[PDB]
Amino acid sequence: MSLSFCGNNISSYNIYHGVLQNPCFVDALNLVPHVFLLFITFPILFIGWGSQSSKVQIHHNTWLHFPGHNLRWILTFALLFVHVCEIAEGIVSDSQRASRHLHLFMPAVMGFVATTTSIVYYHNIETSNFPKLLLALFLYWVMAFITKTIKLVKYWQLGWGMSDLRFCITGVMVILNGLLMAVEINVIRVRRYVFFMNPQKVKPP
Amino acid sequence: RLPKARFIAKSGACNLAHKNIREQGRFLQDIFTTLVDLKWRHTLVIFTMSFLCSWLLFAIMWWLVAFAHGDIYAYMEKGITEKSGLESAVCVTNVRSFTSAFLFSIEVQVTIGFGGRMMTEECPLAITVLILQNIVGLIINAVMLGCIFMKTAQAHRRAETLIFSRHAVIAVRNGKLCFMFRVGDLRKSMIISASVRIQVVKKTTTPEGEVVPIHQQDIPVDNPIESNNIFLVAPLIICHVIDKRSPLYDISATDLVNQDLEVIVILEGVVETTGITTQARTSYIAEEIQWGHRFVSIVTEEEGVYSVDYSKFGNTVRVAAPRCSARELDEKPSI
Amino acid sequence: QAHRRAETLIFSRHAVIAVRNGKLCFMFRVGDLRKSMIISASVRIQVVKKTTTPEGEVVPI
Numbered sequence A: 001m002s003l004s005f006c007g008n009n010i011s012s013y014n015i016y017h018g019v020l021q022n023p024c025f026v027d028a029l030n031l032v033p034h035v036f037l038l039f040i041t042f043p044i045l046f047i048g049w050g051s052q053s054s055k056v057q058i059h060h061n062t063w064l065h066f067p068g069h070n071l072r073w074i075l076t077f078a079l080l081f082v083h084v085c086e087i088a089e090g091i092v093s094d095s096q097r098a099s100r101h102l103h104l105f106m107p108a109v110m111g112f113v114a115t116t117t118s119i120v121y122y123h124n125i126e127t128s129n130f131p132k133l134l135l136a137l138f139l140y141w142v143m144a145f146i147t148k149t150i151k152l153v154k155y156w157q158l159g160w161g162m163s164d165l166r167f168c169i170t171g172v173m174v175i176l177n178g179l180l181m182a183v184e185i186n187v188i189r190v191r192r193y194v195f196f197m198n199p200q201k202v203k204p205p
Numbered sequence B: 001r002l003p004k005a006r007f008i009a010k011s012g013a014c015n016l017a018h019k020n021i022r023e024q025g026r027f028l029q030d031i032f033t034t035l036v037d038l039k040w041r042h043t044l045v046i047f048t049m050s051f052l053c054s055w056l057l058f059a060i061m062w063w064l065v066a067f068a069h070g071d072i073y074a075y076m077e078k079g080i081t082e083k084s085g086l087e088s089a090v091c092v093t094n095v096r097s098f099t100s101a102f103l104f105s106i107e108v109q110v111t112i113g114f115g116g117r118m119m120t121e122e123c124p125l126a127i128t129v130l131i132l133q134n135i136v137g138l139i140i141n142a143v144m145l146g147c148i149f150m151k152t153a154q155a156h157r158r159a160e161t162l163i164f165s166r167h168a169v170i171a172v173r174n175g176k177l178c179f180m181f182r183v184g185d186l187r188k189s190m191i192i193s194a195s196v197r198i199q200v201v202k203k204t205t206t207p208e209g210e211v212v213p214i215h216q217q218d219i220p221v222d223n224p225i226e227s228n229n230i231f232l233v234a235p236l237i238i239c240h241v242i243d244k245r246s247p248l249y250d251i252s253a254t255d256l257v258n259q260d261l262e263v264i265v266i267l268e269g270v271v272e273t274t275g276i277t278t279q280a281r282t283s284y285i286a287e288e289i290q291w292g293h294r295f296v297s298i299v300t301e302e303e304g305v306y307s308v309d310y311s312k313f314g315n316t317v318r319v320a321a322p323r324c325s326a327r328e329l330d331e332k333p334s335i
Numbered sequence C: 001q002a003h004r005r006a007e008t009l010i011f012s013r014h015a016v017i018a019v020r021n022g023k024l025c026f027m028f029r030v031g032d033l034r035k036s037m038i039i040s041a042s043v044r045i046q047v048v049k050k051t052t053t054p055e056g057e058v059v060p061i
């Protein structure tokens, strides 16, 4: 006997009735984006840019502001808060159930660390002059957003009560992810793959 | 409160500061350039991080691939050994847990392949992800192998070790003044095609408006064939006489105590074992220019064989010298 | 073959001619961007022209 991400109950993995209309498969799918973002954003930040182009004395905190930076910090702090709430609800529910049922909160924890890594990646890639990499981040959000949606709609088909704690708590994540996606899009113009001026201006200490 | 800005600190490393630069960017090809050159402490981590990441990622992919095909249901729930006979419909034989998928990804990528977890012919997506995982594994393997060989190629070169004396001198040789430092070498291999150049850095206005702020003249080093080369095994003394053409010709004994001079010295050449060019540079502000002091004999013929005694590399002894100017000394005989 | 990036020696857009140290002088500006230094450097300036010879041969370039 050990961890059972789908509940240690037979037929809890019986996918005969429908392909994605399962309580745990949706959770695992939602988990996947974090276990992709961490493993595509750990070493890139680890092996920083160390090549020599012009000099070593760069303007400290050169581009202190970034396009749309005002929302980012507060929005991601709210994302951390809602992840905390989700993990709390799961963990409090856990003690009533029989088996471990890691599907309750493992995605929440993985998303917590993923969001913290996202904040670190944003700050370490924006302050230094390297926005061509930032495009990668955008992909994550899209992926993550889709999975989050893939959850919520199904719940409506199951019609969980609006007054229930879990459904209400999990609802806001989709909107938070959408706002974050819009924030990432709005700074899409200066640095992107093509057809942009991509104007270069240095900023004063 | 700061002292006059120095062009080159004692450890080379020209400390200029270029600003107003047309900052291109990074191009994402800088990351690989940095990665090929790291201190060995890191390249035993990025190796482990890359391998372990790729393994775990493909393990989760196998887990979901098996999970969505209903295999895990057939293994876990249906009869353990006797009550159930496999329908052969499974996607990846005998992987009924996540740890099983981990021990399958290790097999499928490190080319171990124990054979207790075969690949059947049912699930096309499984074959697709097998092709993709194998390709990714080979690409990562080749990149890491090339990185390790590159960082084994650079095990010969360590650091430039060519030692100039602390402070220079100015003395009398053959009835004429001079200006001497002391170069030297440490490691076993000699230098090949070694060359020496002496530049004096100054702020020299011109009678026609132009005022070059930091301008660098070149001055010859003493040699009986007018060749800037030098062949050194024991420390030499690269003198450079002063004459009307030379810029130090107007230096003075007292004015040098408050004067704007900057005699940088650069030395180039290759090393036989490495076969790589190299150079070393230093500078001598007025504060560390003595006067009258001459360098000390260092080589003494012992009973058996010659000995160079580093114990007194930069020691100097006072000796006769006039306090007049170069132009004073060369002005007239009686002068 | 990844150590290389590209050329990094920069010239002035325009020349200059003036009087220095009493006589006419031709100028040009040279600068560098790469942090690593450039050892054993050398420069050469050449005039390219269509010429004439008393014997008659003409070299176009």
Ligand SMILES: Nc1ncnc2c1ncn2[C@@H]1O[C@H](COP(=O)(O)OP(=O)(O)OP(=O)(O)O)[C@@H](O)[C@H]1O
Residues within 6 Å of the ligand: B020, B021, B022, C010, C011, C012, C013, C014
């Ligand atoms: N601040 C700078 N940083 C990097 N490179 C520069 C800078 N200024 C000029 N250059 C380079 O010097 C060359 C000629 O520059 P120039 O003196 O003509 O300035 P400019 O008139 O602004 O140049 P351009 O017209 O190309 O913008 C150009 O090829 C350019 O790449």
Ligand SMILES: *[C@@H]1O[C@H](CO)[C@@H](O[C@@H]2O[C@H](CO)[C@@H](O)[C@H](O)[C@H]2NC(C)=O)[C@H](O)[C@H]1NC(C)=O
Residues within 6 Å of the ligand: A009, A010, A011
């Ligand atoms: C988990 O295993 C239990 C074992 O009792 C299953 O029990 C279900 O309980 C409801 C309550 O009415 C009934 O439908 C049956 O007693 C069981 N449901 C069936 C056979 O469909 C339970 O099915 C398992 N969990 C889930 C989500 O199916």
Ligand SMILES: [K+]
Residues within 6 Å of the ligand: B110, B111, B112
């Ligand atoms: K093998």
